[PDB]
Amino acid sequence: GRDQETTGFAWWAGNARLINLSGKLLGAHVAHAGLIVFWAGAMNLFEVSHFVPEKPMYEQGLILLPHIATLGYGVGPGGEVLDTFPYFVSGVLHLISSAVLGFGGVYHSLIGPETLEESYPFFGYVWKDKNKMTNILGYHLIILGCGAWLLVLKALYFGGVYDTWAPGGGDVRIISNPTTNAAIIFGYIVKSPFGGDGWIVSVDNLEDIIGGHIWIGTLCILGGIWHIYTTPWPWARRAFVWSGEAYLSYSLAAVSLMGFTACCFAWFNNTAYPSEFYGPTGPEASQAQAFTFLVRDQRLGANVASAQGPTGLGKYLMRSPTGEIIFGGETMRFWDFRGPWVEPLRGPSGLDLVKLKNDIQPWQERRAAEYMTHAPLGSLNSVGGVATEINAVNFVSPRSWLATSHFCLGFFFFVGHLWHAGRARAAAAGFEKGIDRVDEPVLSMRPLD
Amino acid sequence: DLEKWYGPDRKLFLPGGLLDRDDVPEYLNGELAGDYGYDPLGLGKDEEQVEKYRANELLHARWAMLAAAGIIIPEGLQANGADIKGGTWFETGAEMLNGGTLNYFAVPFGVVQNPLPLAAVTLIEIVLLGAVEKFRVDGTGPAGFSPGVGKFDSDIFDGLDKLYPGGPFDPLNLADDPEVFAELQVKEIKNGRLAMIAVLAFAIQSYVTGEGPYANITKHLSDPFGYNLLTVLQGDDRVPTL
Amino acid sequence: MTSILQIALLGLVLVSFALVVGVPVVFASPNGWTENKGVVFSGLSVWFLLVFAVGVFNSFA
Amino acid sequence: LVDDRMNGDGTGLPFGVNDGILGWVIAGTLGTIWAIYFVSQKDL
Amino acid sequence: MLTLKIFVYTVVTFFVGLFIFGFLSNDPSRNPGKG
Amino acid sequence: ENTSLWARFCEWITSTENRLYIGWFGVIMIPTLLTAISVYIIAFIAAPPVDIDGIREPVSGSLLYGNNIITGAVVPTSNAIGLHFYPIWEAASLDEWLYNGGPYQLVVCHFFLGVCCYMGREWELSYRLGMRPWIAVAYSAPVAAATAVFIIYPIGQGSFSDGMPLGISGTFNFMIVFQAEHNILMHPFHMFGVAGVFGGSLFSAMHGSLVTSSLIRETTENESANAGYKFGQEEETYNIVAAHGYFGRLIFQYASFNNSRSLHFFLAVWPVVCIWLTALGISTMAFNLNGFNFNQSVVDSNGRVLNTWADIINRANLGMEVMHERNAHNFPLDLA
Amino acid sequence: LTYDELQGLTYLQVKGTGIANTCPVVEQGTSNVRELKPGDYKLEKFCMEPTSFTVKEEDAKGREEFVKTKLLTRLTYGLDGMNGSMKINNDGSVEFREDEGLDYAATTVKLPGGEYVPFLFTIKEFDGKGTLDSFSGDFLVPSYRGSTFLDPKGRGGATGYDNAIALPAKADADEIQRLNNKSYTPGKGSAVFSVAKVDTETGEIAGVFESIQPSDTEMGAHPAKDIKITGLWYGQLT
């Protein structure tokens, strides 16, 4: 690396010194991808070594073993792990790939070519070559489309993916006839982000999940071909700033939106994030608390339909703002929650009082109580539930962990997008170092008053 | 076009940052097709021994291409529904041991019962192959009538180039231009090396799994984690790690 | 059979440690990469051989 | 029912529209602004 | 309440279209310096 | 040549000759914030009582219904609604909309859009004036804090009724309930934020003291000491060195802040990063990450629980917990 | 929508649309109303929905009138999922009785002039006697809030302070009505029904109803108003 006297960047901005050095920049990326897959493999091996089989997966502080378990690699018809060898294989393969990628990144960072155009014109690129940048973007889009179609192939033909909505309490279900309806998929992408709709978190079945994955993979492949075989239009040239920093800022804004959205998936979704592996969501364990007390107090003999709590609304059953019958407690905010242990109990008009009186399954009875106990409360130093509890149980929900961390990372990356977008605009305009002091723009403007 | 495969600045078996340009042996200077500078053992010795072994490499390459096609295609037809009766390559000889005979499937109008026995097939194969292998060294062929040139005489193989004889062996031409001829030579030697690797893979996979390569690829595409080298080396299964 | 697997994995761990220590040392040394090519290639080949050996021996152990 | 509501909340309505007139005015407003921008681009 | 929704939708669509097409209309070129 | 409608519209919006810069971010900042201002003022003056807890129990909040400036507030949306997007047209009538807390959703949504477009407008004016653009990056910290307390905390808890009430006593109520249910004082991010505002006050006092101390006689006991020269000269003579000299001699002379750019960068970054930390602490507690729980954490050799200052904080926290929304709870423990 | 087509829709198809508050109607039935031969018959799935909420407004000049009002609560009033027994005879005498189910709904309505009127729309413990054209009776009306309900300043019924604490000089006259009493005595309301549009082959009745019940007194602070509730009622009849 250089010093500050030749590059103009201090040590705390050292990665800027390799903005125009394509070979070293590539080495930084390859070593970084090695770091990411190294964390994947190492954390997978750590969670496998720290695995107790009889305990549920969410009570052990495991964040990515549920990610493999959602794919159905070694889970049973109730979330039972049975075997952890797929997890071990995944961790070992990630670690070996980390060794390979780290060797490549270190090689290009240290003794790789300094700049790529003078020796490898296919990999050489300048930031102002819009055709070359769109070529690289098309390559990565084709790669991402193949990655999405890999999950599609696994769900369709390799007998995987765990359906939590399967009768009996979820099961690894091979998916046949995914819903590839364009109106349906675009309806999920354009619906409201609020409670009634949920925008994109509210996808509730693997058929729609795999249909959307088919759509995103085909669209990514077609767009990759399109960017390889095209050049950006003049309106795009006039609208965008074409520099390596501006491209980074675009990526930063996109990945910050992705981080916020993934935080929302973690907190609310229970289909792509099954509760048997991730623990209860926000709405459930509260809906579960309202359900367990209803089924307890009707076993003791009290009429739950009479209800009439301290405010005259209902201790167990009440009416939502829309005429559907919902749970009577304060958990009338989570009245739109849908769970595998709720839907067979739920009908068109409401919660089906006749079903609440007669048809309640023991698996639902066990699941709701065990969800009520393991709420997504928890404190940051472990300990138990609400902030006023005592040192009794060691549990914090993985949904809470990777919702809080992902929101923090998304906000930081939005801040970084602001920083890099502003600096890219200032560098393209020529005043990223300061005001010119002999022709400043303010003295060329009329005073306000 | 041609600079990528010939000359000092050609594609080597290791990249520039992993292999210096003066580390190539002096007898591999990018004058032959498929020159990647790959010779870690002292087998090439000099340029004339390299040229002499090139004949063995090219003959083995063409035979390996014909091989790889002859293993993959009939087994795939037999597994997909054709009446092949012995499509698997390591057991096709056992179907003619006593009185059996292989059915020939000339697509699309296939399924024909050949009546030649094993003794007649072996005799005619040895006779024809000895004749062609003796003609290859001697460079003499009596008759003609090839699509390359109408009814060529016997005095046309003389004066030709061995290991690459044009004329009667080139019905479609497309090789008189030297640059595309050299590029196609590189294509041929690379396809031949791929075919050699493939047929060695076919033999080793057959010995390991007990089935043909088409069965191997179909079962692997059906379940890659449930059927691979790791699975076939393991046996039946293992106790789950709980 | 698992004893051979454990010895191979321990050898893989030591070879990987030697590689992690020495590859930046070989690369960033003044004209050291052009003369340590043989030892670095041998170390990488031994590492890949050990990875493949542990993988193969997993099926038998 | 003692009162009248549109009851369009929920149900995953595209862009929140419950009648075709809302989509039509959205498309018309976007088309009008786009037409003005297109015929008045490049500072004429 | 339907015509209120129509009016609000028209207003929001108008202002969002102004935002989008104004940032499309040569926005990086509005600088006092070169480029 | 700016003879077309969109050309003159762009040249007027982009123009820096306006008294207040509008810009393409201002074309959204102005109407949303004007709508929020109008609805907030009208609701604060004369809004009918709002049932916040969803238990048919309305809080007054508005001056015309009998309270003052300190205890007057625009009340968050009804608990029965949740975070369900309740605008005027989704209500049967304006009376129902006002009973169910719709003004809060309107004002909060418009305020969020307005502060986002305010960051964008700050960047836009910095770009049009040839400045460096990270003033918006500095402003992203109060925007993050307001956004986290107004929308992200309701998203985490499941209802806009968890939003901070638009008022003073409502702010105190939200803060006390937040203490009871999350132990915010026992959160390192909140500790960082408190240290950030305290250090920001410290550093503002230090910077003002060192600049106003380091002067020369240009303004006497009268309004100005212009006897040497009147207005209209470029002779800068304030001070450059003695401020850093005094700050060095104050403690140990090696805390080098002689670079004015480094000093001002520190002044900018310290409260901004600490407010970022405390805003993200609020955002994490929105998903019930809570504070440090050292309650009954000290036990003796016989295992008997020894009391602690953390235990006294726990007693105060659960005293707050049993008194919050005393009529809203039916089931024993409280889960978001 | 009838009951047959209500069961034919999924929960997601009727969520957020207000159909779940509607009562099912009878389409293929007859208006003869005299098709019910036997008695002691045990009706089920009785459900009621109002169509108007009018509040009795006694002025201070001496005449009686009801006024149209505006609802503040959303579609959370309404009666569903409750059963009972009906003893209908051959001559036409009808003995109505409702025992259990979701037989109440807390409703807040706004008078003209901006006065909040909360009430508990109840039909619980209702016995109805009369013919097919009109049978009426009385039903129990709970207060509104339970005995553990706490007002703004503690106080409450069963639980609380029983005085306004943040005023040390208290517990005297003009406050006993607000502090000491805190009455939760149940009231009674009278409703009149009517049967029309009966289905014979499956037993369905869906007529209209008119109910009069007292409003909420909070905890006895102010005297109750009277709420007139008119609307449709439906019940499966098996």
Ligand code: CLA
């Ligand atoms: C994701 C982390 C990351 C990565 C991948 C990089 C990568 C890189 N940085 Mg950088 N940097 C980082 C973080 C990172 N940095 C941080 C946090 C700071 C602030 C402190 C800096 C500050 C900084 C400056 C000031 C400079 C760089 C420079 C560089 C480049 C070349 C380094 C060099 O030329 O000297 C050689 C460095 C070494 C010889 C020491 C590294 C030792 C090895 C390579 C790493 C450890 C060995 C590893 C485990 C081996 C793996 C074994 C394998 C077989 C599995 C390089 C691509 C230089 C540059 O910009 O290029 C012009 C430069 O001057 N960085």
Ligand code: CLA
């Ligand atoms: C972002 C990935 C990436 C990119 C763009 C490059 C690009 C480049 N590398 Mg390089 N390399 C990489 C990763 C990458 N490398 C990794 C991970 C390793 C460690 C094995 C290496 C090790 C390496 C060496 C030793 C050398 C290069 C060299 C070069 C340059 C010559 C062209 C070439 O491809 O050489 C050839 C590289 C290979 C043949 C690597 C094998 C790639 C195969 C075909 C896999 C195909 C990818 C496929 C889609 C699967 C992706 C992984 C999947 C699991 C996700 C070139 C600019 C040469 C150089 O620097 O010139 C001076 C050279 O000496 N690379």
Ligand code: CLA
């Ligand atoms: C300290 C850094 C850090 C760490 C440790 C993590 C860790 C994690 N992140 Mg994360 N992230 C970070 C930073 C970090 N992140 C930052 C800064 C951002 C920007 C704000 C994000 C944004 C982000 C998003 C948007 C998401 C995560 C997610 C995740 C979790 C799963 C990772 C994953 O699989 O992604 C994906 C891995 C890849 C894309 C690599 C491609 C390989 C694919 C997966 C292969 C296909 C698999 C195939 C089907 C297997 C079948 C085999 C086949 C043969 C049949 C994981 C625990 C995910 C999550 O769980 O949501 C909360 C997720 O959605 N993160």
Ligand code: CLA
């Ligand atoms: C993948 C996203 C990404 C990428 C590729 C870059 C790339 C770059 N950034 Mg940047 N940045 C990002 C995200 C990113 N940034 C985000 C999200 C923020 C907001 C926090 C910033 C804020 C930022 C600033 C203020 C600056 C840069 C700068 C730079 C350039 C030089 C970096 C350097 O060598 O500094 C050296 C790296 C370090 C000294 C290490 C940083 C240590 C951090 C600050 C502490 C936190 C790390 C800790 C372990 C995590 C704690 C948990 C977390 C949730 C808080 C470089 C091209 C500089 C620049 O503008 O150059 C033109 C610069 O001034 N960035």
Ligand SMILES: CCCCCCCCCCCCCCCCCC(=O)OC[C@H](CO)OC(=O)CCCCCCCCCCCCCCCCC
């Ligand atoms: C409820 C359904 C929900 C899903 C539907 C969502 C539809 C969203 C489609 C938007 C995609 C358009 C991309 C243009 C972006 C700006 C391009 C530009 O910088 O454009 C500028 C560029 C400059 O060169 O010009 C050009 O290349 C011209 C290219 C722009 C194409 C013009 C759009 C068609 C115009 C139709 C007018 C509508 C007229 C009014 C209808 C009235 C009906 C009553």
Ligand SMILES: CC1=C(/C=C/C(C)=C/C=C/C(C)=C/C=C/C=C(C)/C=C/C=C(C)/C=C/C2=C(C)CCCC2(C)C)C(C)(C)CCC1
């Ligand atoms: C897979 C999946 C799925 C699917 C999904 C999807 C399909 C999505 C999508 C989506 C889409 C389809 C998107 C799109 C987009 C775009 C964007 C997001 C953009 C942007 C940008 C911007 C922001 C702009 C800016 C600007 C302006 C404003 C103007 C001027 C220029 C500029 C640039 C400045 C589902 C869920 C179903 C299922 C599950 C899974």
Ligand SMILES: CC1=C(/C=C/C(C)=C/C=CC(/C)=C/C=C/C=C(C)/C=C/C=C(C)/C=C/C2=C(C)CCCC2(C)C)C(C)(C)CCC1
């Ligand atoms: C350049 C540079 C840089 C960067 C660096 C890096 C990033 C590196 C890396 C790297 C990497 C990324 C690596 C990786 C790796 C891996 C490895 C080395 C591995 C391995 C292996 C083994 C040996 C294993 C074993 C095992 C198994 C198999 C399982 C079980 C467990 C055990 C462990 C036993 C820095 C920042 C310094 C500075 C600047 C410059």
Ligand SMILES: [Cl-]
């Ligand atoms: Cl509750």
Ligand SMILES: [Cl-]
């Ligand atoms: Cl409270």
